[PDB]
Amino acid sequence: SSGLVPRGSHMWIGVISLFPEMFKAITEFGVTGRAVKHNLLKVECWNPRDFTFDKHKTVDDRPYGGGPGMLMMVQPLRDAIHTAKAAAGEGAKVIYLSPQGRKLDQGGVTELAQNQKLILVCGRYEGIDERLIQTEIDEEWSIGDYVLTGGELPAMTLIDAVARFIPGVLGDSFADGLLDCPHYTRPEVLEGLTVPPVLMSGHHEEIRKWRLKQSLQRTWLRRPELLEGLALTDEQRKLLKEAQAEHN
Amino acid sequence: SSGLVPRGSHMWIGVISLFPEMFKAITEFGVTGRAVKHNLLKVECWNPRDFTFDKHKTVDDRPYGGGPGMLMMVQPLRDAIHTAKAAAGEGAKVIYLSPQGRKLDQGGVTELAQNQKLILVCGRYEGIDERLIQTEIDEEWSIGDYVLTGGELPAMTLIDAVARFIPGVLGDSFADGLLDCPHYTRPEVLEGLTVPPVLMSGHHEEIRKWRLKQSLQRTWLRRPELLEGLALTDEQRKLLKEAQAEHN
Ligand SMILES: NCc1cccc(CNc2ccc(C(N)=O)cn2)c1
Ligand SMILES: NCc1cccc(CNc2ccc(C(N)=O)cn2)c1
């Protein structure tokens, strides 16, 4: 690898997936695509299909005890995982994306971002054999309490979220553990709705305090449990009380 | 549209995105790709870039009051939204994916799945002008408490999650509001780990009760707040108590 872009904190992400082409959505486009071109982020995919030996390249298998659904076939998946681990060498944490995993939040994203090397295992069908968790997986993580057709979209969501914390990928993420304040661009009037005059004022301290107050107000109204997680500053306590008094 | 596959509950999803090619990850592959080919799911994209008039096809704009980041330019985004709404005709709910949105969970996925027509607006940069929420957006939803480079991955996560509830897309999603039980496929022994003998027993009622007990045990150990959301059946109360007594 060569180039001029500072990449001390670069991340390597190994991916195990039956649909590696899905990952073009992050490696070919936008901020993540730029990260890849600039060697800040590398996404390398192994497909269990390439580790099959039967004529029809079988990658699913029947669950012991029956059921409607299939599981990922153990041998092709295990061989793909082992190949990824050999490529990564020492220090790679292996993650399985599952609804039974630890719930991802921004704090967890920043913990994951400390790893220089990750391997992300993408389950299809009803998922993977329990014993592969014990033998191959370091951590299970969920992107949220819902079921998807595969772990690819969860894996891409985690890649994108961690990529933002790689220095140089971006040009403020839930600033203060709070929801975003309202923001505005041109025009000054839209369908009779005006930009709050403080944002046109050029008064940097007044704008900062208005934005903080609005963030505290929105977080209180939409997600009050997020405020319970915080030890508010004196300034935040006062702006929230002002917002709550104005609301009432 | 023509074909033989039953599609009474088919869904149309309009998408507003600066990177419509990202959506190939769902429309070209796997279960979602099959849904699209069989006319169960249609994903139609409008790109704000196509609604620009300046020589350089500008789609970002500066925030009033300053800041580090840009917002989506209003005119191209609004025109794209209006074109999607005209294509959808009556009854289309407009969704903006944002961290300040309602938190998606499987119950919310099933509520969203009742809509025959959705429009999903994908924010890039720091997001979109507050007044477009009031004028264009019916509902805001978040896929989870983390920030991504754009609303594309959130949008694709919601499409995939709702697609599973379209009759015919699949061949059991958090069965019972509980985490998955352990499951197993070949071989019978893996790195000295055996398949629980009950799953080889062929006793359908014994297997059902073991799986339910294991689901209740895993949910209790990993996500005990999920049990507080439930009114357990008599059988579930007894299997949980058995699992908790065995654990202690
Ligand atoms: N039986 C459901 C199941 C169990 C493991 C893996 C998958 C694949 N699909 C996924 C994976 C993760 C997530 C998530 N919420 O992170 C959602 N869907 C499915
Ligand atoms: N300033 C952060 C911001 C606000 C709105 C929209 C985006 C775009 N990226 C997103 C959108 C949704 C989600 C989510 N959690 O659903 C995450 N990232 C960003």
Return the domain boundaries, chain A. Answer: 11-164, 175-247
Give the separation between CA B1 and CA A191, rounded to whole angstroms.
37
Locate tokens 């998955």: which residue? Answer: B180
**B7 C-beta neighbours (distance < 10 Å), count:** 18
Q: What is the largest CA-CA distance in chain A?
A: 71
Answer whether B103 sits within 8 Å of A198, measured CB to CB: no
Q: Decide if A72 contacts A124 (C-beta within 8 A).
A: yes
* Burial zone of A209 (CB within 10 Å; 0-12 exposed, 13-18 middle, 19+ buried): middle
3-class SS letters over chain B:
CCCCCCCCCCEEEEEECCCHHHHHHHHCCHHHHHHHHCCCEEEEEECHHHHCCCCCCCCEECCCCCCCCCEECHHHHHHHHHHHHHHHCCCCEEEEEEEEEEECCHHHHHHHCCCCEEEEECCCCCCCCHHHHHHHCCEEEECCCCCCCCCHHHHHHHHHHHHCCCCCCCCCCCHHHCCCCCCCCCCCEECCEECCHHHHCCCHHHHHHHHHHHHHHHHHHHCHHHHHCCCCCHHHHHHHHHHHHHHC
Name A44's bridge partners: A14
Torsion of CA A50, A52, A55, A57, to 10 degrees: -70
Q: How far is CA A81 from CA A59, A159, A178, in A?
A: 14, 18, 38
* Level-2 CATH architecture, domain A175-247: Orthogonal Bundle (1.10)
Give the separation between CA A104 and CA A143, rounded to whole angstroms.
5
What three-state secondary structure class fits A44? Answer: strand
What three-state secondary structure class fits A211? Answer: helix
Q: Would you state the structure tokens that stand for residue B30, as one six-digit string?
A: 């796997």
Best to test chain A binding among B79, B97, B130, B142 (most A CBs inside 10 Å): B130
Give the separation between CA A72 and CA A87, rounded to whole angstroms.
22
Instruction: Tell me whether B203 touches chain A (CB under 8 Å).
Output: no
What three-state secondary structure class fits A210? Answer: helix
Resolution of the coordinates in A? 1.8
Give the separation between CA A133 and CA A120, rounded to whole angstroms.
13
Answer whether A74 sits within 8 Å of B161, measured CB to CB: no
Say if A11-164 and A175-247 have the same CATH topology: no
Q: What are phi and psi of B144, to 5 degrees?
A: 165, 165
Q: Decide if A131 contacts B172 (C-beta within 8 A).
A: no
Instruction: Tell me whether B156 touches chain A (CB under 8 Å).
Output: yes
CATH class of A11-164: alpha beta
Half-sphere exposure of B81 (CA within 13 A, CB side): 22
What three-state secondary structure class fits A113? Answer: coil
Answer whether B21 sits within 8 Å of A31, measured CB to CB: no
Residue B126: CB within 6 Å of ligand 2? yes
Q: How far is CA A88 from CA A11, A47, A114, B92, in A?
A: 11, 16, 16, 47
Mode of pairing for the β-strands spanning A117-121 and A93-103:
parallel
Taking the centre of ligand 2 as the mean of its atom positions, its distance from the CA of residue A159, in whole angstroms, is 15
Beta strands in chain A (DSSP E): 11-16, 41-46, 60-61, 71-72, 93-103, 117-121, 139-142, 189-190, 193-194
Give the separation between CA B117 and CA B31, rounded to whole angstroms.
20
The experimental method behind these coordinates is X-ray
Asked if the bond preceding A187 is cis, omega within 30° of 0, the reply is yes
Q: Decide if A190 contacts A183 (C-beta within 8 A).
A: no
Q: How far is CA A203 from CA A88, A200, A210, A236, B130, in A?
A: 51, 8, 11, 19, 21
Instruction: Tell me whether A10 touches chain B (CB under 8 Å).
Output: no
Query: Which amino acid appears at position B76 of this protein?
Result: P
**B235 C-beta neighbours (distance < 10 Å), count:** 13
Residue B99: CB within 6 Å of ligand 2? yes
DSSP state of A65: T
Q: How far is CA B71 from CA A166, A200, B52, B58, in A?
A: 22, 16, 15, 11
Closest CA to B211 of B177, B190, B247, B183: B183
Closest CA to A144 of B221, B102, B43, B170: B102
- List residues of A with catalytic annotation: 172
3-class SS letters over B152-197:
HHHHHHHHHHHHCCCCCCCCCCCHHHCCCCCCCCCCCEECCEECCH
Name A96's bridge partners: A121, A140
Give the separation between CA A84 and CA A66, rounded to whole angstroms.
31
Half-sphere exposure of A179 (CA within 13 A, CB side): 25
Q: Would you state the structure tokens that stand for residue B28, as one six-digit string?
A: 């070209």
* Burial zone of A148 (CB within 10 Å; 0-12 exposed, 13-18 middle, 19+ buried): buried
Q: Would you state the structure tokens that stand for residue B32, as one six-digit string?
A: 């979602």
Q: What angle do CA A65, A71, A74 make, to 5 degrees?
A: 105
Give the separation between CA A221 and CA A180, rounded to whole angstroms.
13
Mode of pairing for the β-strands spanning A60-61 and A189-190:
unpaired
Q: Would you state the structure tokens that stand for residue B217, as one six-digit string?
A: 């045990």
Give the separation between CA B241 and CA B245, rounded to whole angstroms.
6
A147 is in an annotated binding site: yes
Closest CB to B143 among A143, A152, A198:
A143
Number of residues written out for chain B = 248
Locate tokens 């549209």: which residue? Answer: B1
Give the separation between CA B186 and CA A71, rounded to whole angstroms.
10
Number of residues written out for chain A = 248
Give the separation between CA B226 and CA B80, rounded to whole angstroms.
40
Taking the centre of ligand 1 as the mean of its atom positions, its distance from the CA of residue A142, in whole angstroms, is 8
Instruction: Tell me whether A224 touches chain B (CB under 8 Å).
Output: no
Q: Would you state the structure tokens that stand for residue B182, as one six-digit string?
A: 């352990």
Torsion of CA A123, A126, B107, B213, to 10 degrees: -120
What's chain B's Rg over C-alpha atoms? 23
Half-sphere exposure of A33 (CA within 13 A, CB side): 10
Give the separation between CA B32 and CA B38, rounded to whole angstroms.
10
DSSP assignment of A124-182 equals: -TT---HHHHHHH-SEEEESSSS--S-SHHHHHHHHHHHHTTSTTS---TTGGGSPPPP
DSSP state of A92: P
Closest CA to A226 of B151, B144, B140: B144
